[PDB]
Design a binder for this molecule. Structure first.
Ligand code: A1IQG
Ligand code: A1IQG
Lengths: 262, 259
């Protein structure tokens, strides 16, 4: 248990670090998607010709679906780096056993990537290149082989997750809660992780009540989204395994390679 | 928003109905498991054969040992489906939902509730059966042949973790209601009154846990995290059923009963 003044302090600390760690916030993403601006408008990629212009406008040689896939891997690697930097700011995290720090990151980064990818998404597509571009859901769904099925589950989650109307100050605490999960396989000291997560959960609960006072049981509704998050991470790895069987000419970043091994 | 007095009334209503619907409560099961008439113990092949003679099993039809135990699990699950169906009728609002939505919620909810309530009957060493007259050891179940041994052990693995929350029957009655009223089941026609009821049930669960476990910080949050897991475990479960129903190729009528 924490005094509410301490829970607010924790929320502000976490929101402050999130702003420092993640260059493209949900608030900026919404300003870009929601228009009414001329200085923030993205170039829209919806087909092969517009993709080819995007290389000139927004600014590898292989099949289109490969190039896009590789682009995502590059950005996922960046997200892992941003997420790693943020986790170190979570009070208590860097004091955990070093093996547990690694373990929490390995199983946590993908659930967080999907969570924050939703910020960049609406039902028609997703922001890319730090919001300079926007690639349509339709174009992603039409990519060949297994690559077309890759992107769409992300979109089905995002439309549902986005209906919660969370802002960055909410997401910063939620993301912290995800990292400090005591049920990750192979954890050596579950209890101090659970202790940190209890404080974070208290902070999330008070934050959601203050920031969405008319939004009954939003706390419980947000935690249920773990279900959706878990399900997509599993579909994602199962699709990766197919690609690792069909496209043996293709390599993953060492960081992603290590995250997925077991 | 609901007044706290209304939430307590809801909690009491659900507890009373849960007591009526389910033969073996968690409180009774714990009395048995903790040794506080000893149940007949099945720990190997010879005691299984005597337990079938001694206990009056209702599932013994004109097979291999691991099969017979599996069919026992099926027989009891079909029983639980009807007990859970009857309980749902008592959840305020449930019977006024669209009839297809009532069916849809039960169809996707019973498996999660069966796993949840199976934990009440389990400890790290085995499981109560036949309304607590029997006890089958975890070790004997874990050691069954082909995939059957790997079928039973996940139930125990979940139950040991779920039981560490130390919920009692009055907590579980509201929790079970929350699972049934899940507005994200596929094929639902009118989600809004379902989420509205679940919102009331969630409010009631939160107050129940705070009053009944005042020292158990964020237990509400921890229990909701367990609903999450249940989804993944049930999916692992059905996929295993599909394999057993495919690789271990009785009567077509029996096949229909257990569809
Ligand atoms: C050309 C081009 C297209 C889109 C982007 C934007 O992509 C992302 C941006 C961010 C961000 O800016 O924070 C964060 C995550 C992604 C993203 N990760 N991701 C995956 O899970 C993934 C991973 Cl981990 C490893 C290997 C392969 C994949 C992937 F094949 F599935 F892609 C996505 C899947 C679909 C979509 Cl639409 C986005 C992502 C940049 C450049
Ligand atoms: C010989 C013998 C052994 C044990 C029992 C007691 O079993 C149960 C009792 C109850 C109860 O009394 O509330 C409730 C569920 C089970 C039980 N279901 N079950 C399943 O696989 C299952 C589940 Cl989880 C959900 C849906 C459908 C099924 C099933 F159709 F596939 F069966 C088990 C697996 C292992 C164990 Cl150890 C117990 C169960 C009786 C007789």
């Amino acid at each position: 248990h924490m005094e509410s003044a301490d829970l607010r302090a924790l929320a502000k600390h976490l929101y402050d670090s999130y702003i420092k760690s993640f260059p493209l916030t949900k608030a900026k993403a919404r300003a870009i998607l929601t228009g009414k601006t001329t200085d923030k408008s993205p170039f829209v990629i919806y087909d092969m010709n517009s993709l080819m212009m995007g290389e000139d406008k927004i600014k590898q040689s292989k099949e289109v679906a490969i190039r896009i896939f590789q682009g995502c891997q590059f950005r996922s690697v960046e997200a892992v780096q941003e997420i790693t930097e943020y986790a170190k700011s979570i009070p208590g995290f860097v004091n955990l056993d070093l093996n547990d720090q690694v373990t929490l990151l390995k199983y946590g980064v993908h659930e967080i990537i999907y969570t924050m990818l939703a910020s960049l998404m609406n039902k028609d597509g997703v922001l890319i290149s730090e919001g300079q571009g926007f690639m349509t859901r339709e174009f992603l769904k039409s990519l060949r082989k297994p690559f077309g099925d890759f992107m769409e589950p992300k979109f089905e989650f995002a439309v549902k997750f986005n209906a919660l109307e969370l802002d960055d100050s909410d997401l910063a605490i939620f993301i912290a809660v995800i990292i400090l999960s005591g049920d990750r396989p192979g954890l050596l000291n579950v209890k101090p992780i659970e202790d940190i997560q209890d404080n974070l959960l208290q902070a999330l609960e008070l934050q959601l009540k203050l920031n969405h006072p008319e939004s009954s049981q939003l706390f419980a509704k947000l935690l249920q989204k773990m279900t959706d998050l878990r399900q997509i991470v599993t579909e994602h790895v199962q699709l990766l395994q197919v690609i690792k069987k069909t496209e043996t000419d293709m390599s993953l970043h060492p960081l992603l390679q290590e995250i997925y091994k077991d």
